[PDB]
């Protein structure tokens, strides 16, 4: 019942697995992108998975072949699986949704995050 807050994060050693999770505000398909964000401390943010309303997804490549974005319509959900993690995936991941309109004469691009879950990798 409560939005915009990612959960599932936490600790696990090297090889492990977890599945981060955060629900919409609202109809999740009225999104137009939604992308799972990292930030480690003394680095800088960086898109990790993104999921457009049709179905595409974009992937990093340190994660490619590991970490699954994926969506639930009907909990209105967007998942991150992490697996096989690694020391270098230990950080703080941030949920955002991309909302995009417009007309002949505007444009509109709102982007609503949470407050992210911690991931630590233990070597």
């Known amino acids: 019942q409560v939005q915009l807050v990612e959960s599932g994060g936490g600790l696990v050693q090297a090889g492990g697995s977890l599945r981060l999770s955060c629900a919409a505000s609202?109809?999740?398909?009225?999104?137009?992108?939604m992308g799972w964000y990292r930030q480690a401390p003394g680095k800088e943010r960086e898109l990790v998975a993104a999921?457009?309303?049709?179905?595409?997804?974009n992937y990093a490549d340190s994660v490619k072949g590991r970490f699954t974005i994926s969506r639930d319509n009907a909990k209105n959900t967007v998942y991150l699986q992490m697996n096989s993690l690694k020391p270098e995936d230990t950080a703080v991941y941030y949920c955002?949704?991309?909302?995009?309109?417009?007309?002949?004469?505007?444009?509109?691009?709102?982007?609503?995050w949470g407050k992210g879950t911690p991931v630590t990798v233990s070597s």
């Open positions: 999921i457009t309303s049709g179905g595409s997804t």
């Open positions: 609202g109809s999740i398909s009225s999104i137009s992108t």
């Open positions: 955002n949704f991309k909302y995009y309109s417009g007309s002949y004469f505007y444009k509109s691009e709102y982007d609503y």
